[model samples]
Structures are given as structure tokens and as C-alpha cells.
Target: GALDIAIIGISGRYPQARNIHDFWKNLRDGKDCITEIPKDRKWGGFIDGVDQFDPLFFHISPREAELMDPQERLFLQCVYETIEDAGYTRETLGNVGVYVGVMYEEYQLSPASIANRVSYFCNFHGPSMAVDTMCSSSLTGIHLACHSLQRGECEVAIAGGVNVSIHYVPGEGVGAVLLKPLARAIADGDHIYGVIKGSAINHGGKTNGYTVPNPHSQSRVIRRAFEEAGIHPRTVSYIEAHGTGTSLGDPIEIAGLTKTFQEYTKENQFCAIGSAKSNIGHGESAAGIAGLTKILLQMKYKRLVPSLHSRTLNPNIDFSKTPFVVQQELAEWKRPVIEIDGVTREYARIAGISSFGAGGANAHLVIEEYIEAEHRPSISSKNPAVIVLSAKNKDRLREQVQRLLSAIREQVLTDNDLAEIAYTLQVGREAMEERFAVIVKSISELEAKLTYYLKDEADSPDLFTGQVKRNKETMDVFAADEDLQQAIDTWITKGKYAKILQMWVQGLIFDWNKLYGDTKPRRISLPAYPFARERYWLP
Candidate 1:
């Protein structure tokens, strides 16, 4: 049976990377982030600010947070970011499953509470479990989460892995991906990074040793995954292998992948192979996510990143005969063009990710690029859109504004992207105290107003800064029986955005959804919240 599960949102922290952006920079620049620290000068990859947190943001008390394990602390933050990245906030987000991959013992030592902590922190009301399958844990978590959604256990799910490697180079990484059924995701107007067509998990039975992996078993899991998805192995153009880069393990993984492809075709060197461990080192329990995140980001960037420390090919594995090629450098990930009914249709890339546990378990996920059935044009007949920004404080709020501006300027966006950006800013983000809003007819005009605000230049009509003072209650202004409410509704109907902007600054929490009543705007994957990371570790 085949199913469509979408990776709607994603977030991660690894090695020198604070967010996936930093991770992408390292991957694009071909920089190996693993390095030594000042303490003993011994080599290791470390997460920055391991002892820091904005405890108050999530309502966790300083005393409680100080003693919390870094694994759970980082996991909690990633879950929050993942949800928001999908354009949902705590209030707007609904019941879901929480499946986290973790095994290492921190101060708590017990891995049972990692997933439960996220469930508890977010008040997630559906299934919650802490999965530990050694190195395959995170992908195992995703595999389990997809089944829950398939069985109607939950409509949406948060699944990922986290590990805080202390006293060594195991590399710290935390990743969370928001998932929903493809049909549901499309209906909800959520952004889809890639579709998880299928997944399979199998344990290596009676291997040479308890810790040893079985290449045939690894090949079976991947082949079964494709069989389950009803997709051809020839269609899969890339494999994010459990490329531990081991002389034995690396060759074994490639051999297994090649074995699967052999059943489908005789083609050689069509599939590219790479591993995140080449750059960030092994994240242990978090390794699956590290690889998964890399592939998803590659799908987004539409490029293949190099696998490092592999200038020399392994003599044990024959690359000339196998259908696998080491992605030695960056290259464009292009879609193949085919004509159907006199219309050109592009077939996007398909990727397969494999992760093998130290304890003989293996998992594989098939991710395919999602393309729209048809182009949905932006609602832009020279009509202006409302853009908003908010944060816990002014400093953070301005910082976010700057980030948004940069995002607008740097990316080669379309006319539709402007509308998507506006919609994402309004309904997608959690409204905070320090808020700012603007209404503009074009992307350039919006850019102009944001630039002026950052420079502290002359005040513009488009800019609206919400007052710091407001009642701490759900919005009552919308339903209040008054001519004021009636006038505001009328203005919104007629697109008199200037009056609406004034009303927002005066502390009325209007349901901005009313602005786009019939013309629903799509959400964009914008930058996540900038945390005010103050130290909260125990003394």
C-alpha cells in the first residue's frame, strides 16, 4: 500500500550550526564543522550555548530548567520551532503525536521522558513516545509517526531526534519535522518540503556479531520500502546513506543500495551518495535526523552537496559497476522535462535515506519532490497586502524585521511570494507584545518602509507599531457590539488598510483572517523566532 506523508516543517541544531541555515552554509561551503575546544584541545564537535536557554519563553521556571538535560532542553526548542515553521503556533496548533529519538543518558539518564517532555511542554494531547533504536532512532521515529497518521491516530505529528554528546566528538544535534498527511497538508494550505512516499524498518537478524550490520538485510529494508511505495528504484536519484564513512560500513551500505538497484536496472552511477556525518561527525541517536535534514535541505536548495574526507574511493567497493556515485562537489539538482498532452511536465528529484543502528536495526525513507498540479497565481491586481512582525521584545522584534527584509531582498521571489509572505506573517506567526504592521501595494514599497524603520528615518504612512500596553486576554474587540467594530469590518471589506493599521497599534487584536476571507493566501517557510538565549544551566 502507498501513502503520501508530507514533511511540512523542519528545524535542527548541529555542531557549529545554530539553525538549519547555519548548517546549510557549512554544507555549501564544504566546511567540516568538527573541531577541538579550548579545554583539553582534544578534537570534538560541540553545540554552542549548551548551558543557555530562554526558560521564560516556554513558561519553564529557571529552577526547573537549570537542571533539565541538554537533550530534552534542545528537543523542546526544536519541537516549538518545527511547529512554527509549518505556520502554526501553540494556540493555533492542535493535538498531535510526539515521537523523539534519543538513547544517551544525560543527567536524567532515562530516555523515557524525552518525547513525553515535548508532549508535556506543548500540551500535545495525542500519542507520545520516546523511541530508542540506536543510530536508526530518528528515522524510526518518523516511520512510526507516519503510521500513526495513516491509522488516524493523529492528523498532525512532531517527530525527530536529539543528542547532546558530552566529553567527546559525538556531535550535538536536535531535529524536529512537522508531518501531516499530504491531502490534509494541501487542504490546510501548509507548505510541503517533500513527500514521504514510504518507509521501512528491519532488524539485522543473526548477523556476524550483535553489533554488526547485515548488508542483505539493509538492502531488503530499502527494497521493501520502494515496493511498499510502489516506486521504481530507477526513479530514486539519490541515497543519503548511513554513510558512516567506515571502510567496512560505507562499502556495505553502498553494496546494499546497489543490490536493490540491480533488481530494477543495469544503469551505473546515476544515483548520488552522501552523508551528513562527513561534516558534523556522528550524532549517535541523532544521526538519522542529521542525514534526513541534509537531504530535505538539498531538495529545497535544489543542489547536491559533497561528501567530505572521501577524495579516495574505497577499493572494497566498485564504483564503476554500481549505480552509485559519490557527490564529490556541489551540483544543481535539476528536474527532468517530459511532455504530456502538449504540456511540458517536469519530474522532480526522488531521494532515499538509509540509517542503520549500532544494534542491528535499519530504516529507510523515500522522499520525493512535491510539485503543484498547476500554478496558483498570486492575488495581485496591484492590490496591497498587510505584512506584520512581532517578538517578545522590541530588540528581538527589530531583529526579526531585519531578517525578513534580508529574506525578501536576497531570494529570487515572484509576485506570488509577496502575498505568501504577507499571509505567513499574519496568520502563521504567534502574535506577540512588540508588534509592527505595514500595508503596501508592491514588494518594493514594503521593502522601502521596512528599510526606513530600521534606519530610524522619517515616519511613513505604511508603518504601524502596536503599542506596548494591551489587555492580557483573548481578542474581544471583534465581537463587541459597537459601531467601532462595524467601521473596522467595513474598512477591511473595502481595503482601507490605513484605519485597520491604526486600530492594531491601539491594542485591538483583530482576527486578520477576515482580511483574506475568500482569497486564502498560502504560507511561506520564513525564519523562525530568534531566541534570547540566556544561560540557565545548573551551577
Candidate 2:
């Protein structure tokens, strides 16, 4: 028996790309995100917003947040973004595990401590670990997550790593992915980015040196991944390589990949290969996850991203005899149709990702497109869906309103479902004390209403705002499942959405899950929390 896992959500912040969607644009447009180090600093990839965070948003005391490393701070934000994008809340993630990777940085915080804090804050009571195996750390972290899922140790896994030594030479970044068993993903109506077929990791024991990579070990890992995945080397159409771009490292990586493919087929120049390092430099512990995130985007958009600074293939690589080619330009992903059992059909999109640690650890993963029939959410018949927004205070709440307007104004939601947008905002987000709500029947009305509130143009009847009171003595009887359903139906029919809002702020717990019934809307990527970050440097 075998099981496959699906990547249900992804989030990342790189040198120039602060969000996952923008990162996709950078890759798709063939933008070079690397830059020269600032005059005051050593060589490295610098992120613009590394010095800011809102501790109160996550309920962390300013003193505690100030003492935390930037790696922890950035990774924590990514965890929240990833989970929210996956259409889940803190209360919904039962038995969810967390696995992260961190490298040497200025902060003395242990990786385990960072992982523990995130798991505890999110209330995930599952296996939590922080791993370090040099450059391969993050990919190893993902490998461990896959093991945890296969072993039934957790129902879902949040796996990735971070590298943020702003004072050092390595690039600054943090990335995370939400994973679930394919069956569970389908049952939960999760949106899957791609399927994780299998992965393999091994140490280059007794190599030429501890830091020296063993081509044989790399080849073995790649081959083992293919074996575990039960796929032929010929079926792989691309490789997101660990292309560090060092003259020595580039050739060794190609040699290792070439040797693995040579075992099964004589097919040559069929798979395209590229790397993320050329675009953003190396992120050390976060590099592997960065490359993995890039691959996931490519699979999602059905396009192949170029390998920057690598217009010319390395002279050492023999492309004529190998099944790989150094892809140096953005191209549509294409593959040849093959005859299988006398029926000609296009091959499934298959790819491999590789990450190698400086100290001889090597990791490889096989990823394939999820081709099963997608779970199309049942449409909501209720018109004028209720959209909700909240924050720790009015200022942040207003910022949230502005962000939502920007997202709409920029046409980011042009292809998105308005009903889903409202549903996600209402349910996916955790309700806060200071809250705002608006009911709308269409996207245009939603936009118009948000614009009106942002500009203070008019005190519209559709807009409602409230600040929760602290005394439980004022609380009303919470609605049960049946009562909640009736309340939801009443709002849907009589436009009593405002009454439901009043109940929410008055500390009445309605079984919100009952409202969805069979018509669960797809989750739209909405604006994240507007963190009021300040410099939190350890002096």
C-alpha cells in the first residue's frame, strides 16, 4: 500500500518578492531578484521588510517579540499566511505538525524553540521539530514531514525553513507549505497545488571532505526518489536544481543528475533544468524550500521559469548524451505524447527537486501534478453574502479595509469568486474584538461599499462596525447547531445579517460550520494582516 501527499498551501518572502503571488510574477516575467549588497553591509540578498513586525497581532509581548530572531519572526508570519491560504483557522487544525529548518545566525535561539512557539501559538498539538543539516536543511524538514504523514503521526503538516542573517552574506528568506494526505485533501475540499510523490535524503559519508559533495551520493538519492515514487526517469520533464552557480558545484550537480537518468533510459535532452539561487542567491537553510516553492508555482502556472545568469550551459556538462538541458529562457511547459497500452496520451507532468547541504547531506524529491477531478465547491444560493473584517484595534482594522480595497481595485480578484471572497473573509479569518462587516450581492457593490468606507464618503446603512466588550456577564446564550442553522437561514432570507453580527461581537458562539452545508465556497487569497512592524534589534 502507498499514500501520496498534496501541497495545499504555500507562502514565502524573498529578497524582492514579499508574497507568494508576487514571487510568481517575478519568476514568470523573468525578473532577476538578486542585487548588489548595500554599501554598509557584506555580500548577501537583503529583504526590505526584515526589520518590522506587529507583536500584538500575534499576541506576543513586545519584549518577547523583540528578543526573537528575525528568522523566527518571518517564519511565524509565513505559517499564518500559509494556513489561512489553505482555508483553515487556528481552531480547525487538529493534530497538525510543524517542521522547520534554521542555520547559523546572529541569534542564539534554538530552532526547536521557534517551532515550539509557533505550534503553541497556533494550538497545533502534533509533532513539532526544527532541523539543521546545512543547506539541505529545509528539504530534509519536508522529508521528515512526509514521513510523519505516512506514519499517521499527523493529519496535516506545515513544513519549510527560514534563513535571515541580515548581517551576514547568505540571502534572507522564509518559506512554508501546508501538506495533507491526498485522500484527506480531497475529502476536505482542499485546493492542491501539486502532489508530493516521494522524497529521499542521504549523507555523503566519507566523501573527499566533509564539505565536498559526492556525485555518487547525489545520484543515489535522486535514483532512490524515483524508485520510491515509482516513476521512470524518462517521464520527468524538469528539475529544479540546487544550482549554487559556483564553477565546481554546477558541474557536480549536473554530473550526479546525468548519472541517475543514465540507469533507466538513453533518452537525451528531454528534461529542462533550472535553479532559484541564480535569481535570489542562496538562502542557506531556506534555499531548499525556496526552490521547492518556485517549482510549485511553475506547476501551478504551467510554465517553465528560466535559470538566471546561466544563459550558456556549463561547458563541463555533456548535454548531447544526457536527458537534461539547462533551460535558460522562460517557456511554456510542453511534453510529447506517448503510446501507452496502444492508446496515445500526453505524459503526466513530472519533475524533480534537489537540495544539497554543504556538509554532504543530499536530498531529492519527486513531484507530479494532481490530475484527479478537482472538487468544485457547491455554489451558494444566498445573495448578498456577508463579508467580515477585524483587527486588534481600529487603526489596524481600517488598514485591513484599505488593503481589501486595493486588492479589488488592482483587479487581483477579477478572476476570483466574490461569494468565495466573502465566505473566506467571514470564516477563514479569526474574529477580533474590533470588527467591521458589509453585505453585498455582487463584486461591484462590494468594491463600492469598501471604497465608501475607506474614504468616509458616507455612513452607509450596509456598513456595520463594533468593538467587543470584555465582560462575560453581558454574554447572550450561544447558538446551537440547529439554532445556528435557523439564524443563518433567517439572515439569508430577511437580511438580518446585522443581527448575526451583533451576536458575534456580544460573545455568542454560533456553529459557523453549519452555515456552509453542502455549499462551501473556495477560499480566495485575501489581504494578510497589516503588521505595524518596528526595528526589533537585539542590542
| TM-score top scorer | 1
Please state every model's RMSD to the true fold in angstroms: 3.2, 2.9
lDDT of each residue in 145-196, candidate 2, tens digit only:
9989999999899998888764523677899999999887777666778889
Model 1, stretches more than 4 Å misplaced?
A: 38-41, 336-347, 378-382, 457-461, 468-487
Name the lDDT of candidate 2: 0.79
Error of 1 at 329 (Å): 1.7
lDDT of 1 by residue, 1-539 (tens): 58799989999888888878888999988998887773422566777777767777778888888778877878888888888788887667758899999876675436767788888877789899988788889899999999898898987899999887555246667889999999977878888999999899999999887887899999899988888777777667788978655545678888888888898878788788888887887777687888888888899999999888885556787788899888888999887554434677656699999889889889999999888785687445446778888887888888888988887876655656888888888888887778888877678777888888898755566688865457434345555657867877788889877777766665576678888778586686888888878876654
- Which candidate has the top score in lDDT? 1
Candidate 2, superposed: residue stretches over 4 Å from native: 39-41, 166-169, 244-246, 311-313, 340-343, 372-382, 409-416, 470-472, 478-495, 502-508
Clashing pairs in 2: 53-533
Local accuracy by lDDT, each model:
0.81, 0.79
Q: How many backbone clashes does candidate 1 have?
A: 0
